[PDB]
Amino acid sequence: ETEITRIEVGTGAAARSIAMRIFRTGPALVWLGGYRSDMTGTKAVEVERHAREAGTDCIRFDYSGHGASDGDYRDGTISRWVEESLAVIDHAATGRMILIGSSMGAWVALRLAEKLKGRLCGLVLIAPAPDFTAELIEPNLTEAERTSLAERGYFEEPPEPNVFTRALIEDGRNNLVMKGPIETGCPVHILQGMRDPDVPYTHALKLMEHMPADDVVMTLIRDGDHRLSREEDIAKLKQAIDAMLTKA
């Protein structure tokens, strides 16, 4: 329903076209997706759908190497994808916004939250995966996996296998957000499933511990997995966005 518009991010051989779907109603919502997802995913589609009911705009886009944007995802880094998110926000966000980040998008959202001090009114983090290169991937590397990162510059995770590049892991240490106290200046809501097989729910708890006292809430779902895309999971996401909208 919402048509794709595009901006060029980066210069020279790093220049790449970023696809965006900017919805305008008749406090925008901004979506930041996962590591190898795209803006047509279930949760992303439901966020713009929430914007249609709350009478607000919605900003969705695809990272480079994702969805309808240029490039190979194996050439991407957190810095590159943060850059694209900033560029899309500067181009589309005409005012206040609520950042909604899922997994790697939550890591991107937290980096954007620091540079945002439009203005941030709320944070909704879905199965948040901040610092996952240093917190989750690095401590669980087999000696055969790091040998691949040394001789090949990447490693493969077991129908197409996820490839984590050496550059992604190295750039991740320059984008760590759990370096200390995390002041977002806005209410925060975390959605997390206890049966998450990719981001252990304690990782979300560790992230929440790094946030100060003021308005951080977590909805912990006992039977939820990493995607959290069931109808009941989406219902709680919509309620978390509704809470952000009522306190803004």
The site for Cl ion (CB under 5 A) is made up of: 41-43, 229
Dig out the tokens for 182 from the structure.
Answer: 């995390």
Q: Which amino acid is at 126?
A: I
Contact between residue 244 and residue 187 where contact means Cβ atoms under 8 Å apart: yes
194 binds, among a copy of itself, Cl ion, none (CB under 5 to 8 A by kind): a copy of itself
Provide, rounded to whole angstroms, the least separation between the CB of residue 112 and a copy of itself.
20
What length does the chain have?
Answer: 248
In the chain, beta strands by DSSP E: 4-9, 16-23, 28-32, 58-61, 97-102, 120-126, 154-157, 162-165, 188-193, 216-221
Indicate the residue among 12 and 222 with the shorter CB distance to a copy of itself. 222
User: How far, CA to CA in Å, does 84 sit from each of 33, 89, 94, 178, 180?
Assistant: 12, 9, 17, 22, 25
Q: Does 222 bind a copy of itself (CB under 8 A)?
A: yes
Closest contact distance (angstroms) between CB of 235 and Cl ion is 14
Nearest distance from C-beta of residue 188 to a copy of itself, angstroms? 8
Q: Which does 137 bind (CB under 5 to 8 A by kind): Cl ion, a copy of itself, none?
A: none
Closer to a copy of itself by Cβ: residue 53 or 214: 214
Of 36, 215, 229, 238, the one binding a copy of itself (CB under 8 A) is 215
Contacts of 174 (CB under 8 A, 6+ apart): 78, 79
Of these, 5, 17, 42, 219, which contacts a copy of itself (CB under 8 A)?
Answer: 219
* Residue 204 DSSP SS3: helix
- State the Cα–Cα distance between residues 101 and 128, nearest whole angstrom: 7
What mask, x for binding a copy of itself by CB under 8 A, covers residues 174 to 213?
--------------------xx---------x--xx-xxx
70 binds a copy of itself (CB under 8 A): no
Q: Residue 144 interacts with a copy of itself (CB under 8 A)? A: no
For a copy of itself, the binding residues (CB under 8 A) are 194-195, 205, 208-209, 211-223, 232, 236
